[PDB]
Amino acid sequence: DGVGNASGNWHCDSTWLGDRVITTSTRTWALPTYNNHLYKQISSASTGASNDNHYFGYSTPWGYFDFNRFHCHFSPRDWQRLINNNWGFRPKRLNFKLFNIQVKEVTTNDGVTTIANNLTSTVQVFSDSEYQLPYVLGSAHQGCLPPFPADVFMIPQYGYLTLNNGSQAVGRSSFYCLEYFPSQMLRTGNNFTFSYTFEEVPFHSSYAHSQSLDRLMNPLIDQYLYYLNRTQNQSGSAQNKDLLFSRGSPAGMSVQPKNWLPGPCYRQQRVSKTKTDNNNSNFTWTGASKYNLNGRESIINPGTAMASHKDDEDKFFPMSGVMIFGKESAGASNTALDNVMITDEEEIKATNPVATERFGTVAVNFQSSSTVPFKTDPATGDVHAMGALPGMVWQDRDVYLQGPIWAKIPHTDGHFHPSPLMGGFGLKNPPPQILIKNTPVPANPPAEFSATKFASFITQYSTGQVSVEIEWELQKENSKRWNPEVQYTSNYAKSANVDFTVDNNGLYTEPRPIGTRYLTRPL
Amino acid sequence: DGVGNASGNWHCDSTWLGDRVITTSTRTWALPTYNNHLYKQISSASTGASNDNHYFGYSTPWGYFDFNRFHCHFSPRDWQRLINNNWGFRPKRLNFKLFNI
Amino acid sequence: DGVGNASGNWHCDSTWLGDRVITTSTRTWALPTYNNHLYKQISSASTGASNDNHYFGYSTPWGYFDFNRFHCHFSPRDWQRLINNNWGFRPKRLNFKLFNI
Amino acid sequence: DGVGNASGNWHCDSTWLGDRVITTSTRTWALPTYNNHLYKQISSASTGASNDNHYFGYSTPWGYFDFNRFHCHFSPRDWQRLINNNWGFRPKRLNFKLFNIQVKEVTTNDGVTTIANNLTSTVQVFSDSEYQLPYVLGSAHQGCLPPFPADVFMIPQYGYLTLNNGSQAVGRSSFYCLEYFPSQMLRTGNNFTFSYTFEEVPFHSSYAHSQSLDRLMNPLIDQYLYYLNRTQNQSGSAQNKDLLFSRGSPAGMSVQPKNWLPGPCYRQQRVSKTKTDNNNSNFTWTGASKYNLNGRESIINPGTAMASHKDDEDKFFPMSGVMIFGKESAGASNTALDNVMITDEEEIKATNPVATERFGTVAVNFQSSSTVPFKTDPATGDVHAMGALPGMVWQDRDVYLQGPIWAKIPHTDGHFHPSPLMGGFGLKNPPPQILIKNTPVPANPPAEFSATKFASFITQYSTGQVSVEIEWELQKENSKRWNPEVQYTSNYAKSANVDFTVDNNGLYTEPRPIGTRYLTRPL
């Protein structure tokens, strides 16, 4: 629409209707030139990694837009308003806009850098609406819109992995040229818009359960069902066998017949947040729950949605069963427990097994008396990994303000309960990837013709504004609970700083991860 | 249409209909100044070639656009799809666009 | 329709439409008399098998028609054409005819 | 239409309209069971042939219907009527009918054979209208409808050849199941009909030329064009060079400038019908014109349409340049000149080179005088194979009453003048092959099930009637010639037999091959 006319406005807001909330977020992005406009083949051959870390793939000159975290859309106040008042929520629709494009030319001479406007340069943008590209969103990568609307963010580079045999490729390894797509070319007066509708996904549960699964009975009335209570005489003067049956009573609630089972489990190793109680070894790889796929092992991390610990055991967490967010000023490698924030799944103890303990015990032999004068005592074994049994009920992992929103469900023949293990909404057709790059501008060509492809380019980057608007459907509480509920609250106390704010240096920080499960409902 | 408005989009695709295939290819080109905007007469007199290699002609300051190879239009996957499934093929029509100068 | 009039024709073909393929297969069958027209009770008692191989059942004088293999319908060329070009497939409908008894 | 109702009538006739002739022919055929209903792979590996005779292919249990000879449709009287009166002819349309099917069961016990009717058996018939099968018609094979309408003929077996590397196959070697086609199943009351329209093919030339190509001038008037006549002095007292030019005159007609050239040639070896004048060696393979294809040689036979001999040289014929028909009582191998009938192409001497002589001479050097004191005499060389030059004109090979009618033009990128070298009409879509076989009837199956495919069949054959009706378009003579024309005639003389009749044993014989070129027209 011209050089001197803005192609969009700043739309950062949150509107709460009766059963919907619409969150709008605008951010300022910077997109550099990646790979010098080259597609590069990347692998682990030069890295010299272990067999488990081998890979083969490609690095493209494109960047992508990521808004797959909840704090890209919700302020902490909006998140608190959602989680303190709603029993569930899900996304309905989204709008994406890209506007106010500025391409900047950079020249460095004698150490000093000049930046100018390039009014005739373009950025190519396209949305992969048919999911023809590898989906790298949903792997919890950096590069999302920053939580604070004042922050300017760099656009992450696009790259993918394909089938590999060690550090080598195979015949079925794919290569994707992203220039083989129709792109919209944007000069400084152009904008880009894109709408998307979410499929009907189940509401995420912003509630805990007020009852436990093994405590669903009337505590005053007996049962009409009997169970075997004693196989020996109760008197004890003699030690004779018997078959004595008792009625299901509130005195013994552990032996009452029940209708349902706790969800599946895959036991993790128990690590104490107090380092002195941990074994003096590494055991982060040798003692960890991992799966085998094509000969190379992968840590589960976090796997099945299970309770982090029991009651009065907050000092323990599963070794790779929890989502760990880093605070600002946390290093990339071997940072400290003080620099990370470990989440807790304490609210799903009502239906899910504890992550660090067995599902239960199982009979492993036939008990018998002496006759065949070889008496066989009954024997049980611990069940550490339990798959889905009929009658099982469970809760999924919680979502966090700092955590992912959705994940693409793999296009496979079968999948069981396709809810992402990091938490969120599993979508068969997720929001498509928006891919953006600067169109290469060649430098001065030679006077004589050369068929060698161009390698000298004018160095430039681009900047602009991006808006994402998501409509979310809410599921209101309808509780008849009498006593007040647990709510997420700010701490009232004199503190050097306010939580979820900037410091005197201007650095936005999030003190803690906030989940969703504060309200309760009966099981 | 203006300095700050793009005059075209990137159209690089391949659509397979029942009996047609439409291949679109977009590329970025650089055109220099040739001959310092001069028409020059060229021959083999200074070259001193053999009688079989003698020539006379002209060099113009113009360049030309060439898309007379099959890989300018078909990806290797598209070529494989064509040759593994079709008994024959021929070209029907073409569109040429030059944009974002 | 009579002794000297054929009640069907040989339909063995494969037609490829845009998103469908219709496979037709005709075969010549011979049906004998089974069990001398008797229903017989069969088990493993005379066989003297292991506990894992014990069975009890019945043998009827009937035969049955089976076309539950893919090569009853696809030639190897048709199978190659399907698997080299399609991401998936499934069956929609079938017709069965028995003729020229 | 029933067991006791005939499904067709005998239609054997010839109707002459003004510019059309419609020929109908009915014959009685017998079709056996071929290969025991099996498809067999055939090659030359067991034969142990030479590299030139190697092949790989398949034998099917099907037979085919062939009516690709002119005497399947024309009686000798009709052929004479056509060739004595028409300047050209071509086929317009055809109808094919198969009727009065009878399947017969055969049992041989103790040496005696019983034949019964099988009223419930079928013959499968289909027409290959899309040319999806190898076309084995047009190779001049036996198995056509017999010339005499009273003769009962056996249906030939279908088989084809595919790509071979010696006696082996290759990856691109094809296999065709003919049961993979839709067939019509015919019981004894059913019939089969099929119509076909010929493409617009040029008329075959039933004429000779009254003029020769080198004699197209006015014999009374000179030319206005000059030619170099002498390069030496005419007087002869001295032997000096000169440049003397003469005018084109009727005195020298060989040196007159002309407008056209004789057709292309590919020289053949000259064999005398009188065996004493031939060289004492075999030389039927070592001294023969042959072509090289994929490393194996093939005799041309007959190749380019050229004159068999010159004037007053009827004793000579090209070694493999003539169509040779065998008389009845001619052996399959090494039969006698008395048992074969050699055709003659004497009528196309007006435009075509003689098959056994060179096309002409060509200059092969530069003539010069002594100076460089190395005088160079002019030198010419004989041109034995001449391809098409602009200005060339030629006639095609003649068709015969015993010869083929059409041939399928190979589906190739290029072809030059696609007229078959044996003579006839080259058709891109020729009349399709009609393929017929007896449906297998299994014998008594075992009491217990066996998945081994059936190998025991009830032995049977079939018989029936076949009708072919072809409409031909005629091209009438419009001649202004005064003297009477040469006509094909019967010889008037007392003879022991009549030509083109049966003998006292009932054997139909054709005494001679009859061509078409009797009428004449100016060149």
Side-chain angles (χ1 to χ4, degrees), chain A residues 390-416:
Chain A
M392 263 189 192
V393 291
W394 65 88
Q395 289 269 106
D396 287 325
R397 197 166 288 272
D398 208 3
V399 300
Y400 299 87
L401 187 58
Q402 311 86 6
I405 310 181
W406 65 79
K408 181 164 165 53
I409 302 169
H411 199 280
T412 51
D413 288 319
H415 49 71
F416 178 59

Side-chain angles (χ1 to χ4, degrees), chain D residues 71 112 117 140 213 325:
Chain D
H71 63 194
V112 71
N117 253 317
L213 188 70
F325 302 97

Side-chain angles (χ1 to χ4, degrees), chain A residues 177-233 236 238 240-363:
Chain A
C177 188
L178 275 76
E179 277 91 330
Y180 202 39
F181 288 78
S183 272
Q184 194 192 308
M185 310 203 92
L186 278 75
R187 260 167 183 178
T188 201
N190 300 127
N191 52 44
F192 173 83
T193 44
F194 149 82
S195 288
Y196 165 85
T197 302
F198 287 83
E199 48 194 74
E200 187 209 2
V201 75
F203 285 101
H204 174 80
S205 305
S206 309
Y207 63 84
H209 283 123
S210 319
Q211 303 183 99
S212 160
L213 188 70
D214 55 349
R215 291 292 181 269
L216 293 183
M217 66 280 293
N218 197 315
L220 317 159
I221 316 300
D222 275 34
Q223 285 190 314
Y224 55 77
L225 293 175
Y226 284 70
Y227 57 89
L228 182 66
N229 195 65
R230 314 256 316 170
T231 55
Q232 259 200 338
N233 267 326
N240 326 328
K241 37 201 102 170
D242 222 317
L243 280 190
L244 300 178
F245 296 81
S246 288
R247 205 164 62 197
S249 84
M253 265 166 202
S254 41
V255 294
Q256 288 191 10
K258 299 188 190 67
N259 261 323
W260 315 105
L261 283 161
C265 93
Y266 198 94
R267 194 178 176 174
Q268 300 266 354
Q269 189 44 264
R270 198 188 56 169
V271 183
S272 156
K273 286 173 168 61
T274 307
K275 62 183 257 306
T276 62
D277 320 332
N278 297 318
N279 193 63
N280 216 343
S281 62
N282 217 29
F283 77 83
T284 38
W285 177 257
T286 65
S289 305
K290 55 189 112 67
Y291 66 81
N292 206 12
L293 194 77
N294 202 351
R296 48 170 144 91
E297 294 199 284
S298 191
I299 291 265
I300 310 277
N301 219 327
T304 316
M306 320 201 255
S308 295
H309 50 81
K310 278 161 28 203
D311 287 320
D312 311 338
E313 281 211 353
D314 311 2
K315 76 174 293 170
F316 292 114
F317 64 106
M319 191 168 33
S320 36
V322 280
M323 305 267 288
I324 302 171
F325 302 96
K327 317 216 269 205
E328 288 77 356
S329 79
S333 283
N334 297 338
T335 200
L337 186 86
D338 320 332
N339 299 319
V340 295
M341 330 192 277
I342 308 179
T343 51
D344 228 309
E345 298 294 328
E346 214 218 2
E347 328 77 32
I348 57 171
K349 297 197 264 68
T351 42
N352 292 52
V354 174
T356 57
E357 325 212 349
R358 64 201 191 290
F359 179 87
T361 50
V362 78

Side-chain angles (χ1 to χ4, degrees), chain A residues 3 119-120 122 124 179-185 187-190 439-440 442 445-449 454, chain B residues 2-14 28-34 75 78 99-101:
Chain A
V3 178
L119 293 190
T120 54
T122 49
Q124 311 179 42
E179 277 91 330
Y180 202 39
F181 288 78
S183 272
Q184 194 192 308
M185 310 203 92
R187 260 167 183 178
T188 201
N190 300 127
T439 308
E448 257 80 38
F449 169 73
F454 250 81
Chain B
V3 178
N5 183 68
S7 47
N9 291 317
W10 194 276
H11 299 296
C12 213
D13 210 33
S14 201
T28 291
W29 52 265
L31 172 74
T33 280
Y34 283 126
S75 69
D78 281 335
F99 53 103
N100 293 333
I101 308 305

Side-chain angles (χ1 to χ4, degrees), chain C residues 1-14 24 26 28-35 73-75 78 99-101, chain D residues 1-3 119-120 122 124 179-190 439-440 442-443 445-450 454:
Chain C
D1 55 13
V3 178
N5 183 68
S7 47
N9 291 317
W10 194 276
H11 299 296
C12 213
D13 210 33
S14 201
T24 334
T26 311
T28 291
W29 52 265
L31 172 74
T33 280
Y34 283 126
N35 282 347
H73 314 274
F74 289 93
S75 69
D78 281 335
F99 53 103
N100 293 333
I101 308 305
Chain D
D1 55 13
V3 178
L119 293 190
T120 54
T122 49
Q124 311 179 42
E179 277 91 330
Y180 202 39
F181 288 78
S183 272
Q184 194 192 309
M185 310 203 92
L186 278 75
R187 260 167 183 178
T188 201
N190 300 127
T439 308
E448 257 80 38
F449 169 73
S450 202
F454 250 81

Side-chain angles (χ1 to χ4, degrees), chain A residues 20 56 58 99 177 189 214 227 255 282 358 402 407 444 448 450 453 474 492 509:
Chain A
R20 312 273 146 131
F56 186 94
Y58 293 98
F99 53 103
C177 188
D214 55 349
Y227 57 89
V255 294
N282 217 29
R358 64 201 191 290
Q402 311 86 6
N444 179 238
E448 257 80 38
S450 202
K453 78 161 176 198
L474 305 176
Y492 82 103
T509 40

Side-chain angles (χ1 to χ4, degrees), chain D residues 81 105 377 410 423 435:
Chain D
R81 204 199 147 146
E105 213 270 327
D377 278 2
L435 293 129

